[PDB]
Amino acid sequence: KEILVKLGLTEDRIETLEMKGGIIEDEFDGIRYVRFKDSAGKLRRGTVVIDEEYVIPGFPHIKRIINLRSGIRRIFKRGEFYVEEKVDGYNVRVVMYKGKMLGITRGGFICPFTTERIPDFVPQEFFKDNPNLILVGEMAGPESPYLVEGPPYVKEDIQFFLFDVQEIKTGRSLPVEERLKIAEEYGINHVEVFGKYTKDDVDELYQLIERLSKEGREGIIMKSPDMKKIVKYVTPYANINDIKIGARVFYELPPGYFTSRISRLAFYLAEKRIKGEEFERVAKELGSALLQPFVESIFDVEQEEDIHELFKVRVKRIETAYKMVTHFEKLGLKIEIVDIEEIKDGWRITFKRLYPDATNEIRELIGGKAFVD
Amino acid sequence: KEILVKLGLTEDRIETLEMKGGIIEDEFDGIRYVRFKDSAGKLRRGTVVIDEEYVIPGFPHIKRIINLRSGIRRIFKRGEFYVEEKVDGYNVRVVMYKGKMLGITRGGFICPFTTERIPDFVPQEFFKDNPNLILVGEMAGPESPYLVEGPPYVKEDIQFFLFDVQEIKTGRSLPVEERLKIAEEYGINHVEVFGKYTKDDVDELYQLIERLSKEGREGIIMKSPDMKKIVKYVTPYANINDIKIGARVFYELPPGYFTSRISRLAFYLAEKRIKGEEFERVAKELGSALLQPFVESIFDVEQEEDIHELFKVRVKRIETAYKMVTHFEKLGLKIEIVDIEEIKDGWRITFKRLYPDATNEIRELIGGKAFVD
Ligand SMILES: Nc1ncnc2c1ncn2[C@@H]1O[C@H](COP(=O)(O)OP(=O)(O)NP(=O)(O)O)[C@@H](O)[C@H]1O
Ligand SMILES: Nc1ncnc2c1ncn2[C@@H]1O[C@H](COP(=O)(O)OP(=O)(O)NP(=O)(O)O)[C@@H](O)[C@H]1O
């Protein structure tokens, strides 16, 4: 049926797509849609199609730079660019559909929890005035369904941070200034905007990256005002911390997870020509981030305990918690542990995530398994 | 022609093999042979065939253990096992062919340099007495064509260390005691043999691993006397040092190179329950091993210099140096730099190895390349 709606754009190559990704599904309240698992033609990974008119493009990759002074000079030759806070949460695309506000996560999933929560952060008025518009933003905070951590200054459950506004079908991105007005017009919370800079501002930008890193914050995104040039640069902190987080589940992750972030550290250290004791300090922190969580996980598997973590979320409607478990099932494996209704306007829900692979590999290994490399 | 000689063992699946590995070639002195690049049937990777009678089986993988107390218990339930020095050099298989002594490296390559040198370490008498036998051993030292380092106690160019004796066609391995007698009968230098131990000796084995590690040595191989049970265990030092060596060419190596050895450290640390300051010390050493060479390689590419290393070997016959360059070409890319004839009975030859990939990736990156993860 939506196979015709797809034809309104591409061919029987839709059939070639039916092979392994780019699939059908119903929504938070039974709103059937097609999610592009893999990217075909001009429709990116994570692209959602509800109908010919409502086509929410996938959020593109954002290129990364490893050296800050270059890369900046390379990309923003002599132009001027905005520097925004890169917030560590999860990517959310927000649309209004038949009066319903929707939260589309990166993969192209209409997510129950997000969907339920967006209204708290985005006024309905916006879409009433702007049907043709999508909001893109980071959902971030201590009580998050996905990421373990977030910005240290968000004290209670999730918060929403806008960083893009796009029109539908096209997915074309509105100018920075335009998006900032929207944000202020409608009172939508927005990623911090540190200012407009040039390649000539690399020194004070170093200073910024320094502060953010001392504060345990992710890093920055650089944007041309016409939203055509976009690059990410993460802090030393993000790199070491990502390693600390992931070392606890070492065997749940591809080796590249670790080496990539080792790179990014080396390059930082090279670029700032850090040496002597400051270098030692960083080396030691790389060591501990790699070893301690790993070793603690080993002691754990050894005490016959499982590798797990408990994380919390707040909901309006308890049945959406259950809806999450099913949504998670479309990916990982989580179970409920405690409901504290003792929350105004809802319930704090504690989930449990298990890490079978991490637990099994460590198990076998400490069990004395012999293997080939 | 040798296609019939292969048929004396397998079928027209030899043709299926002709696809991508298991190939023909001539030797150090034009002795044509077939090298098994990939393993088919009962003939392993690196298996050499000179003719139906002379079939040098490939050296098998040696299984690894990551936890010492277990693994030992798992493999040598209550049995008794020999503990040999694991010597960091390169794997060599030695045969006598029509009066010629041959050095077959792991991959199945008749190696000019090794071939030229074996006579210095293995008496001809041996093969005169034992035509049906192969010697397997580690070639190791400061002036090595392959590995960068070796045992710290080998002061001048390469040395040979026996660790297996096998009969031909079968490749069946002789008992430990039998190989030790051979070693002593013919004066072939052998890997240090620390003793016979049981699972009940883990404590003094820990002490051994401790000393070896403080001495910057690889580790140990454990062998049942009938050579049927074989397992490797490397020192903390080997793990950290392997990281230090590889970090300098970080991008020349698969991420797994680094993570695997991070694991092995974690497990060591867990097993010995190392904590407090001793833990800190190891964490710092992991950090420096991962960062400092990397950073120095970055400063280097940046000073427009190339990532390279100079390594030396000694030869009897100068034309075998050239022969090496061609043999290397069958794999990597090396050039000659200096000949010091000023060596009794030959020449000390300085080679140069380049690392294009490491140099190019670092180049682009410090040049500010923007990329996707
Ligand atoms: N101010 C911001 N502007 C744009 N994106 C932001 C901002 N703050 C946080 N982000 C998020 O940071 C993401 C890009 O950073 P990162 O998480 O490293 O990439 P990723 O999620 O791994 N996928 P990709 O960008 O395709 O490599 C975006 O996809 C957003 O979800
Ligand atoms: N005492 C010894 N007994 C057996 N092998 C030894 C000994 N000392 C050194 N070796 C060498 O050490 C190797 C085994 O250790 P390692 O270097 O981890 O193997 P590898 O090169 O990874 N190949 P594989 O064993 O197939 O995984 C053997 O291939 C030998 O070349």
PDB file of C-alpha atoms in Angstrom, chain B residues 117-269:
ATOM      1  CA  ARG B 117      72.292 -18.132   8.329  1.00  0.00           C
ATOM      2  CA  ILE B 118      70.927 -21.477   9.691  1.00  0.00           C
ATOM      3  CA  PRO B 119      74.267 -23.304   9.147  1.00  0.00           C
ATOM      4  CA  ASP B 120      75.650 -21.061  11.947  1.00  0.00           C
ATOM      5  CA  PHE B 121      73.191 -22.624  14.413  1.00  0.00           C
ATOM      6  CA  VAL B 122      72.312 -26.091  13.194  1.00  0.00           C
ATOM      7  CA  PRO B 123      75.026 -28.639  12.385  1.00  0.00           C
ATOM      8  CA  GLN B 124      74.735 -30.452   9.063  1.00  0.00           C
ATOM      9  CA  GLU B 125      75.371 -33.752  10.867  1.00  0.00           C
ATOM     10  CA  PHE B 126      71.851 -33.574  12.321  1.00  0.00           C
ATOM     11  CA  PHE B 127      70.102 -34.040   8.991  1.00  0.00           C
ATOM     12  CA  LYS B 128      72.750 -36.433   7.736  1.00  0.00           C
ATOM     13  CA  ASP B 129      71.596 -38.550  10.730  1.00  0.00           C
ATOM     14  CA  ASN B 130      67.929 -37.508  10.482  1.00  0.00           C
ATOM     15  CA  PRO B 131      66.641 -36.935   6.923  1.00  0.00           C
ATOM     16  CA  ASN B 132      63.034 -37.476   8.033  1.00  0.00           C
ATOM     17  CA  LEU B 133      63.184 -34.691  10.662  1.00  0.00           C
ATOM     18  CA  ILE B 134      62.375 -30.980  10.722  1.00  0.00           C
ATOM     19  CA  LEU B 135      63.636 -28.524  13.329  1.00  0.00           C
ATOM     20  CA  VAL B 136      61.262 -25.740  14.397  1.00  0.00           C
ATOM     21  CA  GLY B 137      62.652 -22.773  16.269  1.00  0.00           C
ATOM     22  CA  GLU B 138      62.719 -19.055  16.926  1.00  0.00           C
ATOM     23  CA  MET B 139      65.235 -16.830  15.213  1.00  0.00           C
ATOM     24  CA  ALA B 140      65.741 -13.877  17.551  1.00  0.00           C
ATOM     25  CA  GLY B 141      68.085 -10.918  18.230  1.00  0.00           C
ATOM     26  CA  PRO B 142      68.856  -7.189  17.695  1.00  0.00           C
ATOM     27  CA  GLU B 143      69.854  -7.569  14.056  1.00  0.00           C
ATOM     28  CA  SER B 144      66.741  -9.289  12.741  1.00  0.00           C
ATOM     29  CA  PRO B 145      65.100  -8.942   9.304  1.00  0.00           C
ATOM     30  CA  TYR B 146      61.586  -9.166  10.807  1.00  0.00           C
ATOM     31  CA  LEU B 147      60.747  -8.375  14.447  1.00  0.00           C
ATOM     32  CA  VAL B 148      62.091  -5.054  15.839  1.00  0.00           C
ATOM     33  CA  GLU B 149      63.255  -6.417  19.229  1.00  0.00           C
ATOM     34  CA  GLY B 150      64.043  -9.714  20.928  1.00  0.00           C
ATOM     35  CA  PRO B 151      65.367 -11.199  24.185  1.00  0.00           C
ATOM     36  CA  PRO B 152      67.435  -8.477  25.915  1.00  0.00           C
ATOM     37  CA  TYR B 153      70.263 -10.940  26.564  1.00  0.00           C
ATOM     38  CA  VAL B 154      71.037 -11.578  22.883  1.00  0.00           C
ATOM     39  CA  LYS B 155      73.555  -8.784  22.394  1.00  0.00           C
ATOM     40  CA  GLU B 156      74.714  -9.028  18.712  1.00  0.00           C
ATOM     41  CA  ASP B 157      72.825 -10.238  15.575  1.00  0.00           C
ATOM     42  CA  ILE B 158      70.257 -13.070  15.544  1.00  0.00           C
ATOM     43  CA  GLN B 159      70.469 -16.379  17.417  1.00  0.00           C
ATOM     44  CA  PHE B 160      68.467 -19.628  16.932  1.00  0.00           C
ATOM     45  CA  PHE B 161      66.312 -21.268  19.655  1.00  0.00           C
ATOM     46  CA  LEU B 162      64.845 -24.734  19.115  1.00  0.00           C
ATOM     47  CA  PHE B 163      61.322 -25.467  20.411  1.00  0.00           C
ATOM     48  CA  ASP B 164      60.043 -28.338  18.290  1.00  0.00           C
ATOM     49  CA  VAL B 165      61.284 -31.313  16.291  1.00  0.00           C
ATOM     50  CA  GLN B 166      58.811 -32.823  13.797  1.00  0.00           C
ATOM     51  CA  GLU B 167      58.994 -35.648  11.236  1.00  0.00           C
ATOM     52  CA  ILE B 168      58.048 -34.782   7.619  1.00  0.00           C
ATOM     53  CA  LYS B 169      54.749 -35.616   5.771  1.00  0.00           C
ATOM     54  CA  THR B 170      52.978 -36.344   9.112  1.00  0.00           C
ATOM     55  CA  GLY B 171      54.286 -33.206  10.858  1.00  0.00           C
ATOM     56  CA  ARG B 172      53.753 -35.216  14.031  1.00  0.00           C
ATOM     57  CA  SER B 173      55.637 -33.705  16.941  1.00  0.00           C
ATOM     58  CA  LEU B 174      58.344 -35.604  18.896  1.00  0.00           C
ATOM     59  CA  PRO B 175      58.132 -35.832  22.718  1.00  0.00           C
ATOM     60  CA  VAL B 176      59.739 -33.066  24.765  1.00  0.00           C
ATOM     61  CA  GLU B 177      62.418 -35.338  26.286  1.00  0.00           C
ATOM     62  CA  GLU B 178      63.365 -36.651  22.864  1.00  0.00           C
ATOM     63  CA  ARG B 179      63.781 -33.092  21.460  1.00  0.00           C
ATOM     64  CA  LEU B 180      65.857 -32.081  24.475  1.00  0.00           C
ATOM     65  CA  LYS B 181      68.256 -34.997  23.819  1.00  0.00           C
ATOM     66  CA  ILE B 182      68.535 -34.061  20.157  1.00  0.00           C
ATOM     67  CA  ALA B 183      69.287 -30.462  21.245  1.00  0.00           C
ATOM     68  CA  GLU B 184      72.103 -31.721  23.474  1.00  0.00           C
ATOM     69  CA  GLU B 185      73.383 -34.420  21.135  1.00  0.00           C
ATOM     70  CA  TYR B 186      73.882 -32.010  18.226  1.00  0.00           C
ATOM     71  CA  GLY B 187      74.557 -28.822  20.205  1.00  0.00           C
ATOM     72  CA  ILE B 188      71.550 -26.978  18.799  1.00  0.00           C
ATOM     73  CA  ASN B 189      70.647 -24.016  20.965  1.00  0.00           C
ATOM     74  CA  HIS B 190      67.313 -24.494  22.653  1.00  0.00           C
ATOM     75  CA  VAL B 191      64.656 -22.288  24.309  1.00  0.00           C
ATOM     76  CA  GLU B 192      65.212 -22.165  28.039  1.00  0.00           C
ATOM     77  CA  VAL B 193      63.318 -24.917  29.813  1.00  0.00           C
ATOM     78  CA  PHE B 194      62.283 -23.816  33.285  1.00  0.00           C
ATOM     79  CA  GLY B 195      61.105 -27.216  34.484  1.00  0.00           C
ATOM     80  CA  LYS B 196      58.200 -29.600  34.808  1.00  0.00           C
ATOM     81  CA  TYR B 197      55.247 -28.297  36.764  1.00  0.00           C
ATOM     82  CA  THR B 198      51.683 -29.160  37.768  1.00  0.00           C
ATOM     83  CA  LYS B 199      48.575 -27.022  38.324  1.00  0.00           C
ATOM     84  CA  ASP B 200      49.814 -27.035  41.947  1.00  0.00           C
ATOM     85  CA  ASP B 201      52.772 -24.812  40.947  1.00  0.00           C
ATOM     86  CA  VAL B 202      50.850 -21.670  39.904  1.00  0.00           C
ATOM     87  CA  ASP B 203      52.384 -19.604  42.704  1.00  0.00           C
ATOM     88  CA  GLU B 204      55.999 -20.113  41.693  1.00  0.00           C
ATOM     89  CA  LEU B 205      54.871 -19.802  38.051  1.00  0.00           C
ATOM     90  CA  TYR B 206      53.473 -16.360  38.941  1.00  0.00           C
ATOM     91  CA  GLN B 207      56.883 -15.547  40.284  1.00  0.00           C
ATOM     92  CA  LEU B 208      58.422 -16.679  37.002  1.00  0.00           C
ATOM     93  CA  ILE B 209      56.082 -14.553  34.911  1.00  0.00           C
ATOM     94  CA  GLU B 210      56.996 -11.730  37.303  1.00  0.00           C
ATOM     95  CA  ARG B 211      60.743 -12.000  36.751  1.00  0.00           C
ATOM     96  CA  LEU B 212      60.480 -12.517  32.995  1.00  0.00           C
ATOM     97  CA  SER B 213      58.308  -9.386  32.852  1.00  0.00           C
ATOM     98  CA  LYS B 214      60.699  -7.267  34.928  1.00  0.00           C
ATOM     99  CA  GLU B 215      63.360  -8.429  32.494  1.00  0.00           C
ATOM    100  CA  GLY B 216      61.397  -7.348  29.427  1.00  0.00           C
ATOM    101  CA  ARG B 217      60.849 -10.884  28.106  1.00  0.00           C
ATOM    102  CA  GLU B 218      57.874 -12.316  26.218  1.00  0.00           C
ATOM    103  CA  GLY B 219      56.434 -15.085  28.434  1.00  0.00           C
ATOM    104  CA  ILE B 220      56.084 -18.847  28.405  1.00  0.00           C
ATOM    105  CA  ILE B 221      54.773 -21.825  26.525  1.00  0.00           C
ATOM    106  CA  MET B 222      53.351 -24.759  28.410  1.00  0.00           C
ATOM    107  CA  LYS B 223      53.723 -28.233  26.851  1.00  0.00           C
ATOM    108  CA  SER B 224      52.512 -31.718  27.832  1.00  0.00           C
ATOM    109  CA  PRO B 225      55.542 -34.100  27.519  1.00  0.00           C
ATOM    110  CA  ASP B 226      53.851 -35.871  24.599  1.00  0.00           C
ATOM    111  CA  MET B 227      53.552 -32.461  22.875  1.00  0.00           C
ATOM    112  CA  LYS B 228      49.771 -32.850  22.640  1.00  0.00           C
ATOM    113  CA  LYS B 229      48.730 -30.012  24.979  1.00  0.00           C
ATOM    114  CA  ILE B 230      50.249 -26.605  24.112  1.00  0.00           C
ATOM    115  CA  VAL B 231      49.351 -23.126  25.422  1.00  0.00           C
ATOM    116  CA  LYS B 232      50.956 -19.653  25.321  1.00  0.00           C
ATOM    117  CA  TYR B 233      50.960 -17.029  28.080  1.00  0.00           C
ATOM    118  CA  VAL B 234      52.688 -13.664  27.638  1.00  0.00           C
ATOM    119  CA  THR B 235      53.975 -11.262  30.263  1.00  0.00           C
ATOM    120  CA  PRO B 236      52.481  -7.866  31.158  1.00  0.00           C
ATOM    121  CA  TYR B 237      55.631  -6.426  29.602  1.00  0.00           C
ATOM    122  CA  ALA B 238      55.008  -8.113  26.249  1.00  0.00           C
ATOM    123  CA  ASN B 239      51.510  -6.622  26.223  1.00  0.00           C
ATOM    124  CA  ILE B 240      52.528  -3.078  27.086  1.00  0.00           C
ATOM    125  CA  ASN B 241      55.635  -3.211  24.884  1.00  0.00           C
ATOM    126  CA  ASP B 242      53.720  -4.596  21.915  1.00  0.00           C
ATOM    127  CA  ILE B 243      51.475  -1.549  22.318  1.00  0.00           C
ATOM    128  CA  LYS B 244      54.420   0.872  22.571  1.00  0.00           C
ATOM    129  CA  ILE B 245      55.954  -0.641  19.368  1.00  0.00           C
ATOM    130  CA  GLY B 246      52.708  -0.551  17.415  1.00  0.00           C
ATOM    131  CA  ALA B 247      51.488   2.893  18.541  1.00  0.00           C
ATOM    132  CA  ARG B 248      54.287   4.465  16.488  1.00  0.00           C
ATOM    133  CA  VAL B 249      52.662   2.942  13.406  1.00  0.00           C
ATOM    134  CA  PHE B 250      49.159   3.073  14.872  1.00  0.00           C
ATOM    135  CA  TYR B 251      47.398   3.301  11.510  1.00  0.00           C
ATOM    136  CA  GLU B 252      49.414   0.392  10.054  1.00  0.00           C
ATOM    137  CA  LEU B 253      47.636  -1.999  12.440  1.00  0.00           C
ATOM    138  CA  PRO B 254      44.084  -3.343  12.974  1.00  0.00           C
ATOM    139  CA  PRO B 255      42.315  -1.869  16.044  1.00  0.00           C
ATOM    140  CA  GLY B 256      42.190  -5.405  17.492  1.00  0.00           C
ATOM    141  CA  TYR B 257      45.957  -5.332  17.860  1.00  0.00           C
ATOM    142  CA  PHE B 258      45.556  -2.735  20.593  1.00  0.00           C
ATOM    143  CA  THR B 259      42.379  -3.904  22.311  1.00  0.00           C
ATOM    144  CA  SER B 260      43.431  -7.560  22.589  1.00  0.00           C
ATOM    145  CA  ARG B 261      46.528  -6.504  24.558  1.00  0.00           C
ATOM    146  CA  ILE B 262      44.479  -4.105  26.695  1.00  0.00           C
ATOM    147  CA  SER B 263      42.315  -7.148  27.595  1.00  0.00           C
ATOM    148  CA  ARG B 264      45.316  -9.231  28.476  1.00  0.00           C
ATOM    149  CA  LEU B 265      46.493  -6.535  30.814  1.00  0.00           C
ATOM    150  CA  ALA B 266      43.092  -6.170  32.461  1.00  0.00           C
ATOM    151  CA  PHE B 267      42.986  -9.904  33.092  1.00  0.00           C
ATOM    152  CA  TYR B 268      46.507  -9.987  34.489  1.00  0.00           C
ATOM    153  CA  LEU B 269      45.533  -7.162  36.821  1.00  0.00           C
TER     154      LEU B 269
END
